[PDB]
Amino acid sequence: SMPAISMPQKSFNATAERGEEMTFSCRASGSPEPAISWFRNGKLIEENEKYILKGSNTELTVRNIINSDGGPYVCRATNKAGEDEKQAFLQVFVQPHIIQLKNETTYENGQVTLVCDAEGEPIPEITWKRAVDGFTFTEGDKSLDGRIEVKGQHGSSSLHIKDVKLSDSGRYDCEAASRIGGHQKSMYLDIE
C-alpha cells in the first residue's frame, strides 16, 4: 500500500541566535514499511552536529537555530508501492536590536532630530525616554509645550525638538520592543 505520512506538528516557531533547537517528526503508514528521509533545499539531510536524526529518520532535530534555518523542511516516505511527501515549516524570529542611535548637537533656539533605527522580526516598536526625568515618548506623542514630537514607522523613530533649550541637553534612551523582548540604547544630546 502506498506510504501515508502523519505529523503531530507541521509549523514551528523559533527565535534566532538563542542556541535553540526544534524537532520535526514524520511517520508513515504502509506496506512494506516506508523509508523516511528529510530534505532541505532539495538536498538530503545528513546527520551531524547541526542536524540530529533519530528513530529511523522519523525525528529531525535542528540545533542552534539561526535565521538561515527558516523555511521548509521536506519529509519523504517511500516504499515499492509509491511515495508521499509533506513539509514541515520553521519560522525564525529575531529579537529587537538597535542598529542606529547617534549622538546629536545643536544650538540654543535651534532644531534637532534624534533618530533610532532597529531590526527585529516582528518589527519592534520604538519608545523614547528622557533620562533627567524619566519621561517617556511613544507614537505620536508630543511634549506639553509642543516643542517635542515623536514620529516613527517600520522599526524606526525620530524624536524632533523645536526651539532647543539648554536644559534639553543630556541623555535620551531609545527602547525597541516586540513580543520577543527588548533592546535599549542611549545617546547624548548636546546643546552647545
Ligand X SMILES: *[C@@H]1O[C@H](CO)[C@@H](O)[C@H](O)[C@H]1NC(C)=O
Question: Is residue 107 within the footprint of ligand X (CB under 6 A)?
Answer: no
| 79 vs 169 by CB, closer to ligand X | 169
Cα separation, 63 vs 72, in Å, equals 16
Q: For the CB of residue 25, give the shortest distance to ligand X in the complex, in Å.
A: 15
Q: State residue 45 phi and psi, 5-degree precision.
A: -85, 115
Cβ proximity of 154 and 185 under 8 Å = no
Q: For the CB of residue 103, give the shortest distance to ligand X in the complex, in Å.
A: 3
| 38 vs 172 by CB, closer to ligand X | 172
| 102 vs 154 by CB, closer to ligand X | 102
Query: Which residues lie across from 183 on neighbouring strands?
Result: 176
Per CB under 6 A, which of residues 73..102 are in contact with ligand X? Answer: 91, 102
- Closest by CA to 86, choosing from 97, 98, 78, 76, is 76
Cβ proximity of 74 and 39 under 8 Å = yes
Cα separation, 149 vs 30, in Å, equals 66
Given 6, 13, 113, 138, the residue binding ligand X (CB under 6 A): 13
Q: For the CB of residue 131, give the shortest distance to ligand X in the complex, in Å.
A: 13
| Binding footprint of ligand X on the chain (CB under 6 A) | 11, 13, 91, 102-103, 187-188
